[PDB]
Amino acid sequence: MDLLTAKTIVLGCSAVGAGLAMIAGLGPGIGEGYAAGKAVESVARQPEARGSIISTMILGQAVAESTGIYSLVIALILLYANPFLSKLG
Template sequence: MDAITGKELILACSAIGAGLAMIAGIGAGIGQGYAAGKGAEAVGKQPEAQGEIIKTMLLGAAVAETTGIYGLIIALILLFANPFV
């Protein structure tokens, strides 16, 4: 078995780091689920305001998604534009 070079070690650790960065998806998932749940609750209370509720809910879900997207960008940088190599 060949010895592991420094570059290979960095690449391997970057791949692990990319996987760990995607844990950020949990927060976005919880946030979006909360937004959707509250949206469903609001439609149940006030079915006539459905259009407005959906608009607000989508906006809130997109904002909640941002942290997950940051994690995705970190993972993409580690995989495709690695600053350490």
């Protein structure tokens, strides 16, 4: 096998692998959506506690975001700093 063939296959698989990882993002979308809905509900109940309701929402949502970030990092690594290239040529 030549180098170009090697790079081609690995990068092609890397593109697919990056896309698969990004699927995980649906999770935070659902979870943070729930927290948003609970915040809306709580604000309706107590329009004056809105400031503390929103700060709590953001905090919990930020935590829920983390796995989405992990996937994005994996995808960006596969796209922009591919760790397989150095092992081929």
